[PDB]
Scaffold this active site. Structure first.
Site, short mmCIF file in Angstrom:
data_model
loop_
_atom_site.label_atom_id
_atom_site.label_comp_id
_atom_site.label_asym_id
_atom_site.label_seq_id
_atom_site.Cartn_x
_atom_site.Cartn_y
_atom_site.Cartn_z
N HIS A 145 0.82 -1.19 0.00
CA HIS A 145 0.00 0.00 0.00
C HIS A 145 0.87 1.27 0.00
CE1 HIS A 145 -2.79 3.11 1.29
NE2 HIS A 145 -3.80 2.29 1.06
N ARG A 146 1.79 1.34 0.95
CA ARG A 146 2.80 2.40 1.11
C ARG A 146 2.26 3.73 1.64
NH1 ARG A 146 7.07 2.77 -3.71
NH2 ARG A 146 5.20 3.67 -4.64
N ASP A 147 0.97 3.82 1.93
CA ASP A 147 0.38 5.08 2.42
C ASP A 147 -0.69 4.87 3.50
OD1 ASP A 147 0.37 7.92 2.46
OD2 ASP A 147 -1.43 7.96 1.20
N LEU A 148 -0.51 3.85 4.31
CA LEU A 148 -1.45 3.54 5.37
C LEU A 148 -1.41 4.58 6.47
CD1 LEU A 148 -0.83 -0.27 5.55
CD2 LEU A 148 -2.86 0.94 4.71
#
Ligand SMILES: COc1cc(-c2cnc3c(N4CCOCC4)snc3c2)ccc1N
Lengths: 262, 120
Positions: A145-148
């Site tokens: 995801h990298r943007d939680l």
């Protein structure tokens, strides 16, 4: 001046009612099927570069691939408007999803006048979030995801957590020999920050020394915020523990978070 | 590789208990046991994450087996209680990258030689 217009996504034809969120490249609106009466979320992304075209199409592809999961926003359809037709003069991409009730943080804000969250409520929020992320990491190859963050969690009409915002996500293309880590563990570090935040209503960047309320979560917080990514838990390590915690407390952690419905 | 030294186990009556131990020649993050019953698949039984003490069990031994470790994080122990015929197997000490997949799939980095456990 996009509000008021009518748009067509194939079979569907529908009306743009209001803004929900503005931002950088994109805007989100409430939209209604003019024939069927059913409501939808509509994200509109603007591009004037082939680079951006690629990033936007990728986001749409991820949304489609992950649809069907109870803690991921349901994909409905997507479309495009060329530079020639658009009110902006740029290419426009339109993403249609189910409409959630709103943003998780807004509902928590209502309730934080009413005292700390109970452990059961934290448990439901965090498990439902982790199950969305588990669905991503189980793809082949895994999707990172990298943007939680707690701001891009939504609450569904059923009172469940819905994960969205796949604009930073990544994976490997043209995957045919491996299971090396490829980023999963950064998502786990981010999830540990969320569990910390939900318990202690502050971002971690120490668990308070005498906390008797959330003690049940302390070992899992530390294990997700492990500096060494190899030591740090996987999503399956986290979910398994959350399941045993829920069973011990006689909670169905997939169930509606009814307390948040007010 | 790490070297694993196993002991304990043997034969016991139904309803009884045994204890296994396994010592590793270096630190590793996660250690557990899997087993193989006659004609059956490899089955992950228990695993421990050293830095947190979080412990992972298969449903087949939940509430009956307890895995622990020493303060030096060199050794793990498995107490096997309320044993039954279904638990007859060779039990193998192992290190792993992931306790949850270890319980699900018996996925390990390195495995010991094995200790026979026979119930009744
Ligand atoms: C119903 O009122 C809201 C709805 C939302 C909202 C924002 N984005 C949504 C959705 N998205 C779908 C993915 O595209 C962007 C975000 S799905 N349901 C959403 C609901 C946010 C704030 C309010 N107040």
């Amino acid at each position: 001046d996009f509000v008021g217009q009518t748009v067509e996504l194939g079979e569907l034809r529908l009306r743009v009612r209001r803004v929900l969120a503005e931002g950088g490249f994109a805007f989100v609106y409430e939209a209604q099927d003019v024939g069927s009466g059913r409501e939808y979320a509509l994200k509109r992304l603007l591009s004037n570069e082939e680079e951006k075209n690629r990033a936007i199409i990728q986001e749409v592809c991820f949304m489609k691939k992950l649809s069907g999961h109870p803690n991921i926003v349901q994909f409905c359809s997507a479309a495009s408007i060329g530079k020639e037709e658009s009110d902006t003069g740029q290419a426009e991409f339109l993403l249609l999803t189910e409409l959630c009730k709103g943003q998780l943080v807004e509902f928590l804000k209502k309730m934080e006048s009413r005292g700390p969250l109970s452990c059961d409520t934290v448990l439901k929020i965090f498990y439902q979030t982790c199950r969305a992320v588990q669905h991503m990491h189980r793809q082949k190859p895994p999707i990172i995801h990298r943007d939680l963050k707690v701001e891009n969690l939504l609450l569904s009409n059923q009172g469940t957590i819905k994960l969205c915002d796949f604009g930073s996500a990544t994976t490997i293309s043209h995957y045919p020999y491996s299971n090396f880590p490829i980023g999963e563990k950064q998502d786990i570090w981010a999830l540990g920050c969320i569990l910390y935040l939900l318990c202690f209503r502050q971002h971690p960047f120490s668990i308070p020394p005498h906390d008797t309320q959330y003690t049940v979560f302390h070992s899992l917080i530390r294990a997700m915020l492990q500096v060494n990514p190899e030591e740090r838990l996987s999503i399956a390590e986290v979910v398994h523990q959350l399941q045993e915690i829920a069973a011990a407390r006689n909670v169905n952690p997939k169930s509606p978070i009814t307390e948040l419905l007010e | 590789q790490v070297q694993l030294q196993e002991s304990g186990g043997g034969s016991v009556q139904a309803g009884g208990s045994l204890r296994l131990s396994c010592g590793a020649s270096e630190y590793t993050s996660r250690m557990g046991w899997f087993r193989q019953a006659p004609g059956a698949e490899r089955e992950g039984v228990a695993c421990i994450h050293r830095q947190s003490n979080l412990s992972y069990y298969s449903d087949s031994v939940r509430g009956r087996f307890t895995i622990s470790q020493d303060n030096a994080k060199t050794t793990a122990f498995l107490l096997m209680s309320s044993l039954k015929p279904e638990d007859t197997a060779i039990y193998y000490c192992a290190t792993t990258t992931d306790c949850a997949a270890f319980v699900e799939r018996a996925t390990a980095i390195t495995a010991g030689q094995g200790t026979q456990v026979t119930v009744s």
